[PDB]
Design an enzyme around this catalytic site. Structure first.
Site, PDB file in Angstrom:
ATOM      1  N   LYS D  12       0.854  -1.179   0.000  1.00  0.00           N
ATOM      2  CA  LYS D  12       0.000   0.000   0.000  1.00  0.00           C
ATOM      3  C   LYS D  12       0.888   1.225   0.000  1.00  0.00           C
ATOM      4  CE  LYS D  12      -4.122  -0.205   0.857  1.00  0.00           C
ATOM      5  NZ  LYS D  12      -5.119  -0.758  -0.112  1.00  0.00           N
ATOM      6  N   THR D  57      -2.953  -5.535   0.538  1.00  0.00           N
ATOM      7  CA  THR D  57      -2.407  -4.184   0.671  1.00  0.00           C
ATOM      8  C   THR D  57      -3.262  -3.481   1.730  1.00  0.00           C
ATOM      9  OG1 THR D  57      -3.821  -3.180  -1.073  1.00  0.00           O
ATOM     10  CG2 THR D  57      -1.746  -4.155  -1.793  1.00  0.00           C
ATOM     11  N   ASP D  58      -4.537  -3.856   1.804  1.00  0.00           N
ATOM     12  CA  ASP D  58      -5.452  -3.268   2.781  1.00  0.00           C
ATOM     13  C   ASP D  58      -4.992  -3.627   4.195  1.00  0.00           C
ATOM     14  OD1 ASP D  58      -8.281  -1.960   3.149  1.00  0.00           O
ATOM     15  OD2 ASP D  58      -8.319  -3.720   4.452  1.00  0.00           O
ATOM     16  N   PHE D 153      31.141  31.142 -12.635  1.00  0.00           N
ATOM     17  CA  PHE D 153      31.239  30.009 -13.542  1.00  0.00           C
ATOM     18  C   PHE D 153      32.018  30.450 -14.762  1.00  0.00           C
ATOM     19  CE2 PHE D 153      29.429  26.893 -16.703  1.00  0.00           C
ATOM     20  CZ  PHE D 153      30.043  25.774 -16.129  1.00  0.00           C
ATOM     21  N   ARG D 170      27.089  35.665 -10.203  1.00  0.00           N
ATOM     22  CA  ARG D 170      25.788  35.215 -10.672  1.00  0.00           C
ATOM     23  C   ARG D 170      25.006  34.677  -9.488  1.00  0.00           C
ATOM     24  NH1 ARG D 170      26.434  29.047 -13.248  1.00  0.00           N
ATOM     25  NH2 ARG D 170      27.310  28.140 -11.320  1.00  0.00           N
ATOM     26  N   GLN D 213      28.868  21.915  -9.067  1.00  0.00           N
ATOM     27  CA  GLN D 213      29.508  20.636  -8.751  1.00  0.00           C
ATOM     28  C   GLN D 213      30.386  20.770  -7.510  1.00  0.00           C
ATOM     29  OE1 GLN D 213      29.065  21.854 -11.776  1.00  0.00           O
ATOM     30  NE2 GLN D 213      29.045  20.300 -13.389  1.00  0.00           N
ATOM     31  N   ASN D 239      19.932  23.524 -11.214  1.00  0.00           N
ATOM     32  CA  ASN D 239      20.507  24.859 -11.239  1.00  0.00           C
ATOM     33  C   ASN D 239      19.353  25.691 -11.771  1.00  0.00           C
ATOM     34  OD1 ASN D 239      22.096  27.118 -11.264  1.00  0.00           O
ATOM     35  ND2 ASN D 239      23.645  26.316 -12.684  1.00  0.00           N
ATOM     36  N   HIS D 241      17.929  28.582 -12.964  1.00  0.00           N
ATOM     37  CA  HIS D 241      18.410  29.797 -13.588  1.00  0.00           C
ATOM     38  C   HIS D 241      17.640  31.077 -13.324  1.00  0.00           C
ATOM     39  CE1 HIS D 241      19.841  26.448 -16.408  1.00  0.00           C
ATOM     40  NE2 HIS D 241      20.897  26.824 -15.710  1.00  0.00           N
TER      41      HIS D 241
END
Lengths: 287, 287, 287, 287
Positions: D12, D57-58, D153, D170, D213, D239, D241
């Site tokens: 479940k 599952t119940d 970067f 940035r 990274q 990332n 932007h």
């Protein structure tokens, strides 16, 4: 037979803007989701496709960013500048609707320029201009609250389709969605927003609820009684059901401890709380 | 000063119902998302927590399933039965708003009881009762369409913030969200929905668009001119931008073939097309 | 003490591309959501921030658009071109993962350049390259299916926490999420996808289900037995519960007609059906 | 050829549980979204629809609520109890996978039984049992962070499709999704989760980033270096932007103040930082 162009408006929706204030080393962040729509004489644009009066939505978008460069004290102040610009800069544009969602950020360990998003609530602002008149509606949404006790529901009618058992102790959980209309543009928007938020939370927590309707009424009352600049507040509160699970089949009991939080369906209680005398059909609620 | 309870409503929202018709081996499926909200004298419920007039949202939910057992020809008919029940069944309930989303299913290889969901569009219906007055609005949403050509945009105003280039060939993509108000209850609801859908698609596709406003106008005009039972149709159409990618920096041209489908922002064009002389601002649109 | 950089990959995710084929008046539409990620020697990028080996994600994005200009027969073919480009274009890039979701469109009344979106399913493709070896996994998702009868569930064990009642007639509804790995890149991708889709729907509808597990096994068997190019198929099927509502409290029976479609929780049955003798843990499943 | 049943599991999923601790007037709230799946001998269930081994599952769902009644110190300890129960309670069940999302709540004005949701992050836990082995992976998701400066970067290769310009200032914004695997079940789960969260936030904020990274590597290293009980941490960082809008066409400069926060596409940087010598590919990562 005969067709007529009725109410209409157009613009750029959901322009995501982040304004960083960095005059000093102590950076500030303003994160907004802006929507701009204009109203006026756009008859020919619809019937003939004549774009002479159509200020491109792309242009409306560029304006949002261009204006942000100058910075703004509050979200409402920013929308006011946008609305004034468009209505006065073009004769055929007589009004419009400018709205924004404001997202909050917190500093990471009080860092000068590192933040984490506070997603516990979203602030809203809507400005509507009609010729010489304008109105502002501020609001809050996405604020989930819950009372584990101090809530009951009984005394309701019992027709042949009623099976709900009365109770004097249940969980009361909802998502606070509230919007309030100011009766003036001269407001300390940030201060009032923080105040209202606190009044709504306080009313929700401290009110011994006999019904979601009563809790909501008390929340709205607190606001109207505290702020003269607010003429009315509308709230839409879902009753997010938390079902007390039946544990008897397993040889147990459940003293208001174990709950199943259902997604749907949910109760939806909505109401307008207003200042006696104030208008009850303002156009800004039409959207 | 004096606080007063204004407009208000409450009920159960999003009751997911699936009705299977299986009197014969050829099973039929009706899949709905129903919301029921009541309006009337709920003053005491809000100001004192007195629930004597509060028909439990749970009871409203139970009513939905019990009524579905009898079956219904159409979603609108189902909502009509629910509305009449609550307004006539309780003296303090003078009206309300009952809505639904209808989800479509197609048979798997024409199987008698095996189906797959058609998620390409969602049908909507809203019934509002206010005293002796009844109003129904049907609609369609989530229907995404696109024209790879036959769309232009030029002749728009150019100010210091305009950078958009005029074009005589661009992609026009939108999500069709339309809602129309009936002027009578005696309508072949399913047949009209199928017709309106086709008229909207046909107008969008065949109209040489000089502007999204124009395409929208032609879509609305076709519906109103075709169906006497409709007094107006409202549309909210996003201009989902598909940007022609600039590959020139790489020495490649792009003859309207390669596009970047941006999420946000997007243009949002909205308008109401109505039968001349029909009601200007029916209350049902307020919600 | 000593920290080591393990598995790693990076690139541009969700590049939305729409390629229009218009060499003739009969336009064609290819709509993709592409993700590109590279693998190789990026040790210095992580430990020192030296980006000499870091092909910018922005560059990977530009490459997707530049390549789309030439067109592509299938999504898989397009991914194969990208994978080869990055692995052979940079010595430090030894492999990677390239994926795409393909969205379907249908012509509006067979129009040459006007289409409507078919949202009833989403096709997927994933290419993984590792040195000189490469593997492709194709799939389908978002395809909701339902059987109104011809499904049962009984014979399960019972313990102190078991309350479920056995049944020989219930609704069986799920979302078909399936992915299959090809044992060669020489495949008629579009034809196989269409065939697999058909085999899954057929097995789902025609199998008298005694369990979702059984239905799923039959769906996987049909695919493996029909396509030599497929070594294994993995499925994840939720059992979307449609509860037969109890109407006796209202004086009515419910002959398998009125159901409540619950959102959560839901059963989740998953399995891998494989061709006897094929690999049991291909790296492409790790992602 | 022959078709074989490979890896498989069922149970479940998304059982929403809210546990209220109310022995004193000071209520505590534990809010979880639990998923339970078993592994073992279910061959017959798939090939013959024989459900003798199929713990419903119940039933699994009922077990979650029954166990919740006794209370649990932490989410991980709750999953451990469930896992041991099913594996030890049924001979054919050799293991499984139990997971949960934990939602946080804050008191309203330090109220004893009134709370509001803290939606700024979601805590996760995954337990996998394979015979005698108990493997646990804790994690955090949905925690959005942003640095307004202190990120650059440059030094990346400029291939024939590279248009990105180098930059020494940035915005670096991402959604922190991290998961770490414990090498022992004897952990102060709440304390370590809090510590790990603080280390990730600290490394993200204080690392002068030369690449996402690098920022990620430093975040992972800080965790491994501080917690002996953690063998590896995996991160998936988008990332997001925030493009510095070009306002020069409007006669204005933009000193890193006005940004457009794009939705898609986005860079997706992922990596595994592990303790030297630890297990390379623990099965729990496959899911």
């Amino acid at each position: 037979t005969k067709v007529v162009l009725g109410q209409n408006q157009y613009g750029k929706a959901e322009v995501r803007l982040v304004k960083v204030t960095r005059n000093t080393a102590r950076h500030e962040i303003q994160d907004l989701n802006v929507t701009s729509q204009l109203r006026g004489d756009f008859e020919a644009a619809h019937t003939a496709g004549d774009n002479a009066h159509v200020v491109a939505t792309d242009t409306q978008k560029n304006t949002v960013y261009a204006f942000a460069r100058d910075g703004f004290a509050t979200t409402e102040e920013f929308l006011l500048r946008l609305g004034k610009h468009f209505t006065e800069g073009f004769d055929w544009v007589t009004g419009g609707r400018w709205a924004a969602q404001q997202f909050f950020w917190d500093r990471i360990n009080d860092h000068d320029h590192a933040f984490s998003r506070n997603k516990s609530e979203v602030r809203t602002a809507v400005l509507e201009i009609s010729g010489s008149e304008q109105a502002i509606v501020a609001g809050i949404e996405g604020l989930t609250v819950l009372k584990s006790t101090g809530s009951e529901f009984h005394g309701f009618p019992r027709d042949k389709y009623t099976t709900l058992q009365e109770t004097t102790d249940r969980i009361l959980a909802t998502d606070v969605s509230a919007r309030w209309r100011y009766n003036t543009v001269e407001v300390d928007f940030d201060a009032v927003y923080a105040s209202v938020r606190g009044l709504l939370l306080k009313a929700f927590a401290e009110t011994h609820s006999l019904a979601l309707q009563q809790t909501m009424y008390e929340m709205g009352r607190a606001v109207i009684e505290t702020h003269p600049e607010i003429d009315e507040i509308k709230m839409s509160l879902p009753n997010k059901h938390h079902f007390l699970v039946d544990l008897q089949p397993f040889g147990q009991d459940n003293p208001n401890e174990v709950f199943y939080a259902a997604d749907r369906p949910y109760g939806l209680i909505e109401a307008t709380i207003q200042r006696e005398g104030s208008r009850a059909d303002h156009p800004i609620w039409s959207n």
